[PDB]
Amino acid sequence: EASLTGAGATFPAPVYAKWADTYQKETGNKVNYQGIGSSGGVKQIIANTVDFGASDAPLSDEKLAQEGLFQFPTVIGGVVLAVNIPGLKSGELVLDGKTLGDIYLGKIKKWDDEAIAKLNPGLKLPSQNIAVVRRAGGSGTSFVFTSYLAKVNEEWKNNVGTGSTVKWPIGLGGKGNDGIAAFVQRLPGAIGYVEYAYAKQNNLAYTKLISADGKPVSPTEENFANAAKGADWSKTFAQDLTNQKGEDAWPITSTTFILIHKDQKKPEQGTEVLKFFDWAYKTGAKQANDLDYASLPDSVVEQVRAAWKTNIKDSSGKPLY
Ligand SMILES: [Cl-]
Fold it and tell me: Which of 15, 19, 254, 294 would be a feasible disulfide site paired with 144, CB 3.0-4.6 Å?
């Protein structure tokens, strides 16, 4: 029985913890995962203070080669806009990318702005102030959210850009996906972006969004998967799944990565990290699905397995898988 430690992205923490809990019950192995944020996850793996780092934002091939890291995706999730608008139920409100950007730009301050009214003709929107909430530190969720906004709002693109950290025009800072859920839940009129599981598990109302194709879509596990159907994984694991074309493609979709060293100095730990993730691909789909994360296609996991065999070695060049 092994004792493993990972750290990073809170985006997939609900499913990683669930997998960790089950894995221990079935095998005795203990995986301790700390949701500290993608930025921290990256610093820890590079500082070798954990067996595996987790980040929603992918490292480039050059950056991976420079740090001697290997990156592989695990699941597909989606970012949603959780809202606390009194008198509205979950899924009722529809926003489009331009309008979401303008709210984040501080250009739209009330819930009954003409712009929101236009997207929701049948709606009785309150003249409530919009309380924008965003991440306090380095966040992979911020990375995918800002990647999406830059694509749909030119002013955001030109003035704030994309990143795990950006100079937010307005908004209160929340710590972690959990912190944003808690803020929205306590601030009437709040809008915050969270990985879907955090909204559902906290009973937060969320909005629908309009697809790249121009259609209103609801955030569901299937719609997260739809957004990835067109990804050429054979080309690279570092797929941009934001604003993807296709029917029922949730527009703010993203996979998330695990980072491990290619040259394993503690090969026993490395072998065990691999087994845990292999077990998760082999047996963790239902648990990911229960939490509304979509599984990667089998073809991708096979690609990942082949890359493990080729890339992960001990200091004697012996593969660990
Ligand atoms: Cl944060």
Answer: 254
Please give the distance, rounded to the nearest whole angstrom, from the Cα atom of residue 180 to the centre of ligand 1. Answer: 9
Taking the centre of ligand 1 as the mean of its atom positions, its distance from the CA of residue 265, in whole angstroms, is 31
Side-chain half-sphere CA neighbours of 132 within 13 A:
16
Beta-sheet pairing, 216-217 with 208-210: antiparallel
- Concatenating the DSSP letter of every residue in 221-270 gives HHHHHHHHTT--TTT-S----BT--STT--SBEEEEEEEEESEESSHHHH
Domain layout of the chain by residue ranges:
1-77+230-239+254-321, 78-229+240-253
Instruction: Tell me the C-alpha distance between 213 and 42, whole Å.
Output: 34
In angstroms, rounded to a whole number, what is the distance separating the alpha carbons of residues 315 and 232? 33
Nearest to 12 by CA among 33, 26, 31, 28: 33
Q: Confirm or deny that 147 is annotated as ligand binding.
A: no
Q: Crossing angle for the helix pair 97-104 and 140-152, nearest 10 degrees?
A: 120
Q: Which of 25, 26, 28, 32 minimizes the C-alpha distance to 4?
A: 32
Nearest one of 76, 34, 38, 41 to 254, comparing CA atoms: 76
The CATH code for residues 78-229+240-253 is: 3.40.190.10
What distance in Å separates the CA atoms of residue 82 and residue 98, rounded to the nearest whole number? 17
Instruction: Retrieve residue 145's tokens.
Output: 């959210």
Same topology between domain 1-77+230-239+254-321 and domain 78-229+240-253? yes
CA of 78 to the centre of ligand 1 (A): 17
CB count within 10 Å of CB 164 equals 21
Question: Is 253 within any annotated ligand binding site?
Answer: no
Cited resolution, angstroms = 1.9
Query: If you write DSSP's letter for every residue of 111-150 in order, what string do you get?
Result: TT-HHHHHH-TT-----PBPEEEEESS--HHHHHHHHHHH
For residue 172, what is the enclosing H or E element?
Answer: strand 172-174
CATH number of 1-77+230-239+254-321: 3.40.190.10
